[PDB]
């Protein structure tokens, strides 16, 4: 499993996606998963889950 992440550039094109290896012995084991994503007003970052 891989998490991929991209964004719009100023000219409306999309950046080449970053990737993060996600598979750790458990998401392979889930069934019907779903992902969550939200920015943070404190400590500007992305909480992905």
């Amino acid at each position: 499993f891989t998490l991929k992440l991209t964004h719009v550039k100023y000219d409306g094109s999309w950046a080449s996606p970053f990737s993060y290896d996600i598979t750790e012995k458990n998401i392979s084991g889930w069934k019907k998963t779903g992902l969550y994503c939200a920015a943070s007003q404190e400590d500007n970052s992305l909480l992905i889950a």
């Binding site: 950046a15 080449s16 996606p17 970053f18 990737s19």
Partner: protein, 48 residues
């Protein structure tokens, strides 16, 4: 962001410093600059 550099001469107050910069993309794109120390007095590089 600058990855690595190499200074031209042996006295770091002279010569040029070549830099290798990479981009915040994927794959990365590598760039190069040069900082001419012959335009550097008081640790302040001239903008040119």
């Amino acid at each position: 962001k600058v990855v690595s550099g190499y200074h031209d001469t042996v006295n770091i107050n002279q010569g040029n410093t070549w830099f290798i910069g990479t981009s915040q993309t994927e794959p990365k794109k590598y760039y190069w600059r040069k900082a001419d120390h012959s335009k550097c007095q008081n640790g302040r590089f001239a903008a040119n």
